[PDB]
Amino acid sequence: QENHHVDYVIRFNYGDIDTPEAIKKFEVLLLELSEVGLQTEVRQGDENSLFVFVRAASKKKLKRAVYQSRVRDWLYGVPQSEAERLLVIYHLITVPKAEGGAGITPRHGEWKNVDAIFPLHDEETNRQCMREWSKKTFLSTEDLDRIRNTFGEHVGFYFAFLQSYFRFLMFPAAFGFSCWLLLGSFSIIYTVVNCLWCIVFIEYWKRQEEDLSCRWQTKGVSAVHEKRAEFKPEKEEVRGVFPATKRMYRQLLQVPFALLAAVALGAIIATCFAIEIFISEVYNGPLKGYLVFIPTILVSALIPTMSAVLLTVATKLNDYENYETQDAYKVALTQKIFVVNFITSYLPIILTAFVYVPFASRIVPYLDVFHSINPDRLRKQVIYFTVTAQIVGFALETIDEARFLTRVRNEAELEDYDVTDDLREMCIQFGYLALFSPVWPLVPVSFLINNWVELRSDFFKICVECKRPWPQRADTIGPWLDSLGFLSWVGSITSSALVYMFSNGTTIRCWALLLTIFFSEHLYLIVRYAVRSALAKLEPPNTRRERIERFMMRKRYLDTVLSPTERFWMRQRGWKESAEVGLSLITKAKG
Amino acid sequence: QENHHVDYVIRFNYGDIDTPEAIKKFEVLLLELSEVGLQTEVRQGDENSLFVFVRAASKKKLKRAVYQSRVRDWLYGVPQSEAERLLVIYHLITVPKAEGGAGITPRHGEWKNVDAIFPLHDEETNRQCMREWSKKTFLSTEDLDRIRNTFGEHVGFYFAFLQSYFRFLMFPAAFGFSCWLLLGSFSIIYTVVNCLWCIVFIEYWKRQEEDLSCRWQTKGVSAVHEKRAEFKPEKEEVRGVFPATKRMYRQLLQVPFALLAAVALGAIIATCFAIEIFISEVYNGPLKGYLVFIPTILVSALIPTMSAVLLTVATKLNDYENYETQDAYKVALTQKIFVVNFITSYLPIILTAFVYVPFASRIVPYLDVFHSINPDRLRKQVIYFTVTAQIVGFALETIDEARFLTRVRNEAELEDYDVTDDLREMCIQFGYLALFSPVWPLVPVSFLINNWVELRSDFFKICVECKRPWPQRADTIGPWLDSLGFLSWVGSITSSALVYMFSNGTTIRCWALLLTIFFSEHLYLIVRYAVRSALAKLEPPNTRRERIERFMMRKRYLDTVLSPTERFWMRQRGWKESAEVGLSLITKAKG
């Protein structure tokens, strides 16, 4: 065994505080970790901090911790290889000591000296599993089980989702390559099939999630976990509270932030249009096409940086709103990231599809300061916003114990893994497919090539580039599925407006634009209901097995358990007297 | 005790079959009822049928039946005064004998001779409770508990729903009387408040249902019950099946039935319009107004009869589709009754609001065979369709053991109670409020007067006019709540189209009609989401009490339960050695 039976290693800083407080905090830390059933070995690894090591002290204490974790589990209503054995020890460290034990928050409150705690990689399993499916291009269910046993299943749902999305992506890739050689752009045949794919993928992954969360034993996780909330009073079985009206008021800061960000990006896009008209009039290039579209390509390449800036602003605003639980914090964060994603990514194309193309005759005289807008302008917007941001990234890509501790010190300085920074890009790609893929039908091919190139890069990052996350116990990919549903809904309006407005070359005839919007959205809702109710009747195998197991358990437990006025109830004291009375009555009445 | 401890009385016919088979069926009936723990006394009550009486044989058998019913309950995951004590005996009679016992289906299969089984009324409780709140006009929670202990809670949810609907109805009554003296008809102020009321009532009753089903102990009832399905094969733990594709095909008979019913009622309404134009041209009356609108009032009074005819056709079509469970049967029946309700009730007003008023100049020359259509024509349509159908009904309304058995024989010939025939009328009233109440704002007053007149008539009918239903264990009012939600959604489009088309007197300007439809529907969805998410944070008392009880039970049960490589884990065998090693390391590093 490479790791010397180490489960978790707990980093403990001392450089902030002075000397004689650090020994008191260290003594109460080790006293908590030994009061709960954990063994501890401290040896320093950093110049500024020494980290302790934590394993299960004995088999009886480990079985007690496993039984307590299972009791909290099946009271809330929700060992194995490594996920269960590391999850019960992370609960043993972190769970707030009214239950479970030892109540260690990572760095926030009363525990500001201890830094992040983290398990250790198993480099044999990681290297063999990384080089095993370097030539597979499609993982299997046993393979997702091998990524579930390590890393937990919060990683398992993310990897299963990315593999299922990559498998469903090659139907619009083949279709939008077939509908590009044959029948051009802005086509009803491609638009109806694209909206059907956007419905079917979400309504199929919503079923695959239930199947996968019945296969793995994490069926329903609504066990909410507290976080570093800053309570002002102490209401009273005591708990710190925070009123729902001050959070309501603080949540109204999202409206001026989103309005000002939309106004600023509209100013940037209008500046780019003005510079484009300037280089269109003033001759500046022998090729003249790529040089007249220089600022669009520059801002399309620069959009990830301003998106990351707005992500840090939204993260600080989300920390200001002071959520009590972690589920509501993640929901609010995903909503703010969705708003920033919309404003940054789809507004430079909505702003030129519905404002600048049709109103070119009234905005070109307003933007031609210091003295021909086709739908090809919109098609080149979609090209430069779904191609160049990845072309630029690829072009920047091409250009004794002394051996164990020196890799523990190397793992302790790595960064921390997240799912959201790699799943936001999935949400952006699905928005580009849902909203205005009928403009240029090679958007699914341009996304399939990028996903096929960066297929194993996320697994490489989760193995060797960042430290191992503690095995979480997720049930869904999160609120991103609700974001995908909303994004498909907006796409069924946007794509059907664009197809009416730009196919076959005049007068827009609004009495027909709004009728197309109305009928296409209310056809989307009906088709989504039909696909959802059809897929709810086809049952995947890993939930049928659990339903059959639960029915057999119920049937066995039920087969175990089963194996004055009174002058009325004395005439027929049994069965045979009632039978002969009925015999006499039928013979008398039928005779 | 008036009823001589009789729980259920089981009617058994013999006039269909001959003599010597009836004694065999009677003997196996009494053998089943005595094999399960029930006492039986048979005495004849009809000329054509003799019915047995059923009570619990002993206290040990009654406690065994109660424990078996509770075991099936809390295995499916879902005594008292009369509801529990009669429910366990109805399960003891009916439950299909693989569990529970005695497997008696009422009249369908293998048991065609036995007619409907039924409990007996308690006339003291019924008369005292009927004359107690003859002067109350608003029932209390203890009062709904007294209607829950008798009659079960499938009656309790219906009575609580009708009382809550009557309490919420007097806000649009007072508002539409206030908005009628002041600001006329087709008004935005009344339309926005009417749509807000239609949202708030449904999103408040959806919360009151959870509160009431936590107060009563019927939290989640998804325990599906089989019915008289006609299986063709015997698949194999054996069960008869029916393929989901033959039911799918049989369910496509609803489309030609609804299309032909809509075409027939459109023909009737066009005939009424032609006769109205005929009496408008040919002078026939000194008053001339009521005489020119004679056929509208005649068909508006006749609509309940053709609606009942279409209900029998829809019931036969629903029996043709051969559903396996009773929940899916009730859902499909409620959907067909909703379609018939729409076609019969709101199509004669949609057909004159969106076809005949605006297209009067192109349809009056087509309907004036044998040789002025204002919005007042639409207002008089709404008046004659929401007033005269109840005025006609009110005008037709104004113009030893020998004593116990002679009332058991009287109760055995009564009809059978249902909820659907009195809840369909609620759904029709809510549709008239949701869709086109802005046309004539005294529609809520005309409904409030009718409900206040017929307030206690349903309780009178459930006591003395029909026999007592067995105590069912419902959880919701049913699919009618989903029908009310769909009906409010259609109303937010219809009312906002009518208000644009008919307020302040020309050119319709479609680019504005469809924009009003779009913005009003997507404002309805946002306001419904906001009201639903706001009401999900205000917790009613009877579910907070159950949450506190379950949390205290979990806390008590959790406080009960808690009260080479190895040369690494030998340097510090305990806590004090790790403490002094950490002390030496901090003093060496900080020195």
Author numbering:
A (entry chain A), B (entry chain B): 11 to 88, 101 to 258, 266 to 400, 420 to 447, 489 to 594, 603 to 660, 701 to 728
Provide the authors' own sentences about this structure as they appear in the paper:
TMEM16 scramblases dissipate the plasma membrane lipid asymmetry to activate multiple eukaryotic cellular pathways. The TMEM16 superfamily is comprised of Cl- channels and dual function scramblases/non-selective ion channels. Our results show afTMEM16 thins the membrane to enable scrambling and that an open hydrophilic pathway is not a structural requirement to allow rapid transbilayer movement of lipids. Scrambling by the TMEM16’s is modulated by two signals, binding of Ca2+ facilitates opening of the groove while the properties of the membrane determine whether the scramblase can thin the membrane enough to enable lipid flipping.
In contrast, in C14 lipids scrambling in 0 Ca2+ is ~30% of that seen in saturating Ca2+ so that if scrambling requires groove opening, we expect that a significant portion of particles would adopt a Ca2+-free open-groove conformation. Analysis of a C14/0 Ca2+ afTMEM16 dataset yields only classes with a closed groove, Cα r.m.s.d. ~0.9 Å to C18/0 Ca2+, the highest of which reached 3.3 Å average resolution. Thus, in 0 Ca2+ changing from C18 to C14 lipids induces a ~8-fold increase in scrambling activity that is not accompanied by a concomitant increase in the probability of opening of the groove. This suggests that the basal, Ca2+ independent activity is due to closed-groove scrambling. In the C14/0 Ca2+ map, thickness at the closed pathway qualitatively approaches that at the open pathway of the C18/Ca2+ map, consistent with enhanced scrambling. In the three datasets for apo afTMEM16 (C18/0 Ca2+, C14/0 Ca2+ and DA/EA in 0.5 mM Ca2+) we could resolve 4–9 lipids per monomer, all localized near the dimer interface in positions closely resembling those seen in C18/Ca2+ structure, supporting the notion that these lipids interact strongly with the protein. No lipids could be resolved near the closed pathway in these structures. In thinner membranes, closed-groove scrambling is enhanced allowing for lipid transport in the absence of Ca2+.
